[model samples]
Target: AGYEPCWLRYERKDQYSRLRFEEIVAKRTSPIFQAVVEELQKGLRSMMEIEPQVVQEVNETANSIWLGTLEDEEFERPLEGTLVHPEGYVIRSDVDDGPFRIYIIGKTDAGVLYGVFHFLRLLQMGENIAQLSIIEQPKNRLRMINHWDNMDGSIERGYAGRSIFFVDDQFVKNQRIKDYARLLASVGINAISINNVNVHKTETKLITDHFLPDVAEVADIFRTYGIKTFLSINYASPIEIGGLPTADPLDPEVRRWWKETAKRIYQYIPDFGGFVVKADSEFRPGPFTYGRDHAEGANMLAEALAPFGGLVIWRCFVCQQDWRDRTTDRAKAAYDHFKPLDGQFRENVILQIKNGPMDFQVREPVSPLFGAMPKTNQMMQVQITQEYTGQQKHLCFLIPQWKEVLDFDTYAKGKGSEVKKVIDGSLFDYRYSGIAGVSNIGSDPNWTGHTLAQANLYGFGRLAWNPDLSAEEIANEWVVQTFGDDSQVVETISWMLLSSWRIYENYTSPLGVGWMVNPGHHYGPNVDGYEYSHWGTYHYADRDGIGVDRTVATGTGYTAQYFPENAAMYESLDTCPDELLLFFHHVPYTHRLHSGETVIQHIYNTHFEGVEQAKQLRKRWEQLKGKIDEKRYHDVLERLTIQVEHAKEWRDVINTYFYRKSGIDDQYGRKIYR
Candidate 1:
């Protein structure tokens, strides 16, 4: 089927259909320029019928497209400060010729490639090309995507199909790699780390001889599209891949081994975007076993990649054990673990923190680490794949959710220092900072499991490209590109994508004590799936109340991780927001929310409301039957059918579970069935 993703069915605009290439510049001057030419050739062949004439430099032609950098004297930028950043660019029509010529200029070759993808996407969206003027630089430094795919062709917690990159412990090269890169590039992502963070035995060889060649091959594909490919490495790689007796970060022998290993891997892929390490957390091996801290563990690998201009992304997903011990709070674990060792990390070492403290729930306050640590470089790792937010089967448009997260007031300094401002390297002058999402893409024919789910991937890229772009804007952009700008298609699908989260939330968990789905697949409904397991996921519902007691007064005191202002606000019952009250406090079923509804009634209302809202999602999709492509439209219809059916299951399960525990009748006379 040509591995066509939703974005792959790009129909070149009728206007830009004939405007293939006014001119082409093939320069072997720089490695980046060489890549630009390679991508140019591919774009030309894909988007247009005839390949434009290639030249070493600009020619005295009537109308042409000049491809070069700011240094090119023949090309002039239409806007100032276009190339101030070494990796950004501006595209405009230059009047250097008598008539005019489209000019794609960058500060570097990578930027030129981005310009090409933007130009193509704009054409696909049917935007006008004449009098072009655009100067774009990414808001975040590390615009990356973290794939949770394993080497065994199975994606961890994947709801879609199997892994596309690996099969039977070998690289398939179904060669859909180029297509995936093109999709990511079109949305403005520049870096990708390919592998599950929870590294297994085969994945340990990702940096070793067994997989370096395959990694290099994948990197080659991404390289053509201006996306730097990275891989998640096992912290115990020294022991797993090599015959090392002791793998300690503080040990000189261990450090020497990693440095040499980094040299070998980078030699294969020079512009390799470096290693993503999940160490010391989740029982992964790190300096903790050796009586050292995170900065020491991170700095050890940072030293290895320093010579090659590589980065070491150290994950901060630590959670304290012994929840029974009231003094140790799980939410405070990240800040407590790494806050003191902030300045100790190497320059290239970035602490990759999740957007929330507990995990990727349907709702969570911003992680305190966003503003708490001033010395450490930080990057917000968002999970767009919905690993915890319904896994794409349930229609959950996350752009609005993510935008709210990005725009959250962290209260880091005094006030007004939002999470986005901090992670985008604005609030704090971070050395390397940006945002990366856990990719929602899978082996589904539509790329994402659901058709409308493609908007999450597209929005993730656009949001990463420009954090300021509103959720509505990104959704509309994706709507136009994916389904063409038909008025009905744009309006209907845009509404579908914008309101998905709330509709999904209404049925799942009323006040955000997440994970009501099945344990392994995390699909459908199982109210007590992780209630009493050793996994530490507890809803804490009894005869009296439902929720975890994270209050500072008599609970885990996890709310104290935030600044004094937020800490006080969340600590008090009157001041705490109702949506997150359960996350921070255990309350009586009769406890009134900020919304004037008791906790139990709120649950009943949202749950019943969520079911009808989920049903409405089907009606909305039906309007687009003949509007969108048959394959995509029908694929979504099948998924929404599943969503509506399972949303009922979720609503019933959650409502019954809470009703049985709390013994509360619905105030609105809704069906409880108990």
Candidate 2:
């Protein structure tokens, strides 16, 4: 076990000795209750160097911590309106009383588990627990994580390491699975899909008898910690695994086969969440293959899982654009494919839309699909892995980026329709909706290869629980818990984490015209890497200008996909933000931005400044050499060093490319390769 415990380190603290309880009293013996008790014991022992006794009952005046569901017993006073959600909890204390007792009551056992973790987090951050009166509940209904892990032990878009759940076509039989469950549970992640959305031959058997047993075991482990397991299923499972001739959604035999498959899967895992389908996207088989729409395909699976209270999370990341098609825009694909079929889908089928219309780019406008479908269940999907944002070799904290997406005003309901409200199921009052992050973890000794990247996972779950939590708040909380409460350590790491996203963006893709990397691996600088490819990503740079004109007046008409307000905003260069100018318009290199600099000059300035900023990041970390552990310090330092060098490469490559394209010289006389 070379792995670290991450933020759950729970380092010892003697300052809170007076507040430590001698016993933990539980009224229920359920699995979640057991988890609550065990977590308390573990956290208490590690943080306070004292073990609390576990007991079934205790006197009201005893010095102990009480754990129970709302139905178990009455409190000293009525908790009339405190607990709203079944997963909500209330933590109160009677510190002024003679015996000094505290109560952690929940609407259910799962709430108790979350309450315990919250209580530990307060202690870990050295917060006052004396006058505790906390009420907590998740804002989103389904806070989920989607793992792109293959059964062959490989992870798609994974930068950390090998698969933590599977290896060599079998479930990884180890304690890491349980530990990972705890890590996810601690941060309030309630749902997870264990396999890649692109389900291959081996993974296609997950819904069958061959793999159901193993799937059930993994499900059981997650269930103990209040997490429901989901499987990513192949759209052509009928032909691939069920021996059906055609995998048509409308075919009677195909429908029956899926219904029977759902029944068998439920037998193995009674509480299985359901299937995540990447249908009709990226060469994946779907109803399109059988001449049916996406709704026809998703509804068929939804009908089968509906009886068991399972859901069908149908992904909306679909596209097949040819580079030759000048009229088509990749940013318009999701909205076009899904909006027309809004009300046609089943109630249990949710359209999982990515944060941006384009795939996981560092900077892109919020997907217009968010509030487009009033009658559909829609959830947000964000990439926690660093895919196009430096792949973890470069420090790029994504919470700020995600915050911008969640807080985007879609104006679907006139003025108050933010993206967060849409996914939280409040905007349209959908049956099921939430947010999901593509998991960034693997079998690396630290879970995430870069130790600091753990903050992204933690922040993802925290935001899913409550999207209103500011990025600065999340960063500070994580820094204090993971590194320590030392002012310099906290301040330095928080600054690095908070600013890393923009820093990475500065040296890389300019103003949202994304995909300027090596074609297959998506790594370093290559201005025209995907320009002439079939992937449909291009900047359309030439001697005069660089950018994609997606306006209705002169280009692909992609801005018209949004609501009236957004359409107007992006359509006009006068109103369009400079950060996303290249994404929506093709402007001359001499086009003066709102920032008082020409497009070419702004690019040159940011690129050169970005290298300096990256070097500063490493310099800041160097100041904390003795404050942090040698292993972690050296590990982060090495990565930061690599980042500085790589950033310079990005700066030079981008400056040189733009200089060559526009035939423009830098105003500041910075070096630009001819």
By lDDT, who's the top model here? Answer: 2
Q: Write the per-residue lDDT of candidate 1 for residues 1-674, one digit (tens) a residue.
A: 65555664556445435664556765435655665665566655655654777776766754566777777745353473446766687888764437456777777777787787777677667676777888887788889999989989998877668888888887786457877887887787889988998888888888887789988988888887778888898888777677787689987788999999989998899888899988864455677888887888889999999999999888885632553454555667778877877788899999999888767878877788888888889999888887767777788888898888898887888879888889888888998999999888778777787777788888998888888998888888888877888898899888888888998878876576776667776766787787666556677778899777788789877888888999998899899888888877888999999899999899999989988987887998897788776877788898899888888888888888888888878888888768
TM-score, candidate 2, is: 0.98
Model 2 lDDT, residue 16, Cα = 40
In model 1, how large is the Cα lDDT of residue 57?
72
lDDT of 2: 0.90
Write one digit per residue (lDDT tens) for candidate 2, span 525-544.
99899999877788999899
Which whole-number lDDT from 0 to 100 does residue 113 have in model 2? Answer: 88
Best by TM-score: 2
Q: What's the CA RMSD for each of the models?
A: 2.5, 1.3
Relative to the true structure, candidate 2 has a C-alpha RMSD (angstroms) of 1.3
Instruction: Kindly report which residue stretches of model 1 are placed more than 4 angstroms away from their true locations once superposed.
Output: 12-21, 25-51, 59-61, 75-82, 95-98, 281-285, 319-327
Clashing pairs in 2: none
